[PDB]
Design a protein around this ligand. Sequence first.
Ligand SMILES: CC(=O)N[C@H]1[C@H](O[C@@H]2[C@@H](O[C@@H]3[C@H](O)[C@H](O)O[C@H](CO[C@H]4O[C@H](CO)[C@@H](O)[C@H](O)[C@@H]4O[C@@H]4O[C@H](CO)[C@@H](O)[C@H](O)[C@H]4NC(C)=O)[C@H]3O)O[C@H](CO)[C@@H](O)[C@@H]2O)O[C@H](CO)[C@@H](O[C@@H]2O[C@H](CO)[C@H](O)[C@H](O)[C@H]2O)[C@@H]1O
Lengths: 141, 144
Amino acid sequence: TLVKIGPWGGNGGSAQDISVPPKKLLGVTIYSSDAIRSIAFNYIGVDGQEYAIGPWGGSTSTEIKLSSEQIKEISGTHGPVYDLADIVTYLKIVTSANNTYEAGVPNGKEFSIPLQDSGHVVGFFGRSGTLIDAIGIYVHP
Amino acid sequence: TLVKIGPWGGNGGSAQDISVPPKKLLGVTIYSSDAIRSIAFNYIGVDGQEYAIGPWGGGESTSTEIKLGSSEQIKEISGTHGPVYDLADIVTYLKIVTSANNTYEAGVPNGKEFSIPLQDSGHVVGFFGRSGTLIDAIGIYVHP
Ligand SMILES: CC(=O)N[C@H]1[C@H](O[C@@H]2[C@@H](O[C@@H]3[C@H](O)[C@H](O)O[C@H](CO[C@H]4O[C@H](CO)[C@@H](O)[C@H](O)[C@@H]4O[C@@H]4O[C@H](CO)[C@@H](O)[C@H](O)[C@H]4NC(C)=O)[C@H]3O)O[C@H](CO)[C@@H](O)[C@@H]2O)O[C@H](CO)[C@@H](O[C@@H]2O[C@H](CO)[C@H](O)[C@H](O)[C@H]2O)[C@@H]1O
């Protein structure tokens, strides 16, 4: 059973999610400028099938390759950009191998999920249009 | 006395144009990501005055700034227009080449092409078109 946390961000765009619960996160690609513009990710679902999700959204790429490497901390901001009121503007991801990735520009209210013990992020959900209006996470205990 | 060519692109947005005919183009700023988002330009009118036009369309953190030397001319302009996001026909890509072998690109080639390679002394001195949140369509004024 996965923990599902979020979303953080605004009401714009359309809700996005995944149907097969993730077992294992294989990688994440984020495109960003002054806002988080898109996210894509591939995972092995609990059914043992690979799913290539996205991209959700619509610049600068941030590519996150993960066999024993897990997302252990995820944080960011959401706020006003591009005459839109509340968009995910910044993301920071730290892995169990101590690799740190940043995308976007800190702007607005913060959120942060520092996972202890064996917890790790295995997938995402949220809201999107031309940008990532809101983002949420699936967490494997 | 000026040649006016275009526009290329869709029918969305609002029409944009300039009232004082351009004599000399000083610079162009293009804002773009996957498509052309806005254009601004400064020129000397036939009346000897400097006009700062727009930005037509919406802004971006990322601009392509085309500052033209006192003898530098836009000699070739080309691009594409097609569907992006949920819009049918937007200017998606521009390529500008000056007489000093300076090349500028914006957007991502996507859709039908247009191209205006000017020979002899012809050169682009201004623009018109259609804009909203993006550049729906673009056209040019050409000084012979
Ligand atoms: C593309 C997308 O996924 N859109 C979903 C939308 O998300 C909204 C979207 O807003 C975008 C930002 O505003 C952006 O940077 O600018 C984008 C383009 O805006 C022009 O075009 C749209 C139509 O596509 C117009 O609505 C805009 O007013 C805007 O204005 C026009 O500018 C053009 C170009 O110059 C010109 O041609 C027009 O004439 C001019 N209009 C006027 C009046 O002058 C814009 O698309 O993304 C942001 C950021 O992510 C979100 O915050 C926005 O909410 O959300 C809706 C839901 O609210 C989605 O529709 C749903 O889609 C699902 C399927 O996913 C299902 O079909 C639902 O039924 C449907 O409601 C939409 O897909």
